[PDB]
């Protein structure tokens, strides 16, 4: 019968609880507290311009009706309890296709303290959207955002505040960066207010900074370009009488440039303007024509 006391407490707790009404309807606004613990930062994609992120999206708000007097003072209720009480709706302003896992039992823990403070956390897999500026490719340092705000409740009813001091709220795991191209730098958080046709809604913001690694592209494209240009400048030291040799030597450098440029420009994602590697490739490609026309006039 050691569970009967707790079952009676809980059934009395849910006696006449109306989940459609947020806590303190006519009283002060509800003040949700948010905190993210990014488990692993997924593969950023250049083509689709989406980045996958994993989070343990934590929440906490003070609900007055759920207070109780009991022996345990911290109820670690199951996952099914989370649906009957109020749960604030928190969507992602720029997330294309998210997913909440349902692996072996819905991943949601609900803790009720004696005071009435709740705790509520999910294990999402967010797939946001971040516009990129490839004007400095492949040396760009762009920042992908993540905006989450309350829905269906204006600013006069629900206000978000970071759980801890904002510098130490959005935490990234030590070895969780399953990311290959870029390198992670830090986090930046900033509250805000976004006015719309319906009303004024509160909107938290998070900026993740990224900087592309160049070590691969150095041994991929730039160094073959430099080698090809240096090779095309070798023709001047050949003898002026051996005409066919110099002609073949000049033509094959252009052939190499064409092959290299075609191989390199394929991986570049489609853009309207011209990337910063295009200028280098164009100049590297024009110097060989210069040397060829020089040989011609000679």
């Amino acid at each position, epitope marked *: 019968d050691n569970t009967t006391v707790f079952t009676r407490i809980l059934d009395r707790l849910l006696d006449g609880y109306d989940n459609r009404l947020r806590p303190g309807l006519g009283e002060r606004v509800t003040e949700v507290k948010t905190d993210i613990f990014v488990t692993s930062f997924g593969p950023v994609s250049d083509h689709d311009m989406e980045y996958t992120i994993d989070v343990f999206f934590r929440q906490s708000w003070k609900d007055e009706r759920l207070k109780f007097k009991g022996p345990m003072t911290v109820l670690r209720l199951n996952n099914l309890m989370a649906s009957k009480i109020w749960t604030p709706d928190t969507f992602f302003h720029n997330g294309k296709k998210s997913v909440a896992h349902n692996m072996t039992m819905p991943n949601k823990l609900l803790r009720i303290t004696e*005071d009435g*403070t709740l705790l509520y956390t999910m294990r999402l897999t967010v797939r946001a959207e971040c516009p990129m500026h490839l004007e400095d490719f492949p040396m760009d340092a762009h920042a992908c955002p993540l905006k989450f705000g309350s829905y269906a409740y204006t600013r006069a009813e629900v206000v978000y505040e970071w759980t801890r*001091e904002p510098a130490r709220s959005v935490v990234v795991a030590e070895d969780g960066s399953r990311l290959n191209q870029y390198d992670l730098l830090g986090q930046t958080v900033d509250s805000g207010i976004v006015q719309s046709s319906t009303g004024e809604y509160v909107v938290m913001t998070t900026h993740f900074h990224l900087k592309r690694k160049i070590g691969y592209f150095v041994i991929q494209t730039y160094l073959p370009c430099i080698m090809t240009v240096i090779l095309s400048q070798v023709s001047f030291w050949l003898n002026r009488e051996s005409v066919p040799a110099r002609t073949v030597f000049g033509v094959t450098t252009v052939l190499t440039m064409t092959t290299l440029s075609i191989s390199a420009r394929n991986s570049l994602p489609k853009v309207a303007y011209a990337t910063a590697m295009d200028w280098f490739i164009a100049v590297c490609y024009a110097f060989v024509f210069s040397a060829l026309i020089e040989f011609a006039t000679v």
Partner: antibody
Amino acid sequence: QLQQSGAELVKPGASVKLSCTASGFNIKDTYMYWVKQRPEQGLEWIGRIDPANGDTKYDPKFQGKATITTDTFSNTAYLQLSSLTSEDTAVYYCARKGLRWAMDYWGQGTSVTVST
Amino acid sequence: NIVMTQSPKSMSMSVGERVTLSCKASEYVGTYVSWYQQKPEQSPKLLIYGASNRYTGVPDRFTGSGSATDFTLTIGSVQAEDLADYHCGQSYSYPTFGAGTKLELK
């Protein structure tokens, strides 16, 4: 909203205990701060306590010289100093976090003078 | 440690004139600056929290604007009682305050 202890006079080397009582709200909701102010200078931060869990942080320059403990039941936060020198002769404040982490409610402040 | 440089150090302005203060922040602080008013021999009060948001009970002449690292307070028609000290303090991280500005009427 907030009250503090009366003016304090103590000789150097001893330790004094200051109190900030919050009336009208349970402190277990918000944090509590402590700020000192020298004469004709800018404010300076001391520490930060969380009455929900008991966690504390401190300004690296005051670390080891100040201790912040709270009594959730009597609804009061206590600041107990270490062996204090004749230098820190200034007023101490207690604050409560506001909306955007701006310390909105301030106490009248107590004056700690180190004399002989 | 974040440092908060406040300028000017002290300035005097006549009644009914426009007054503008600046609080340059060396590190990054994302719009969590808060301006405090301290009259002589009283306790500080909260004027502006965040940026361009007025705490309740504050007159309409107190207005501020904010950016990533540059912050500005803009008083309207200064009055007789508005002479006090003004402190800018960021709470993005473990909070720290500025030096402080004293504004005596002329």
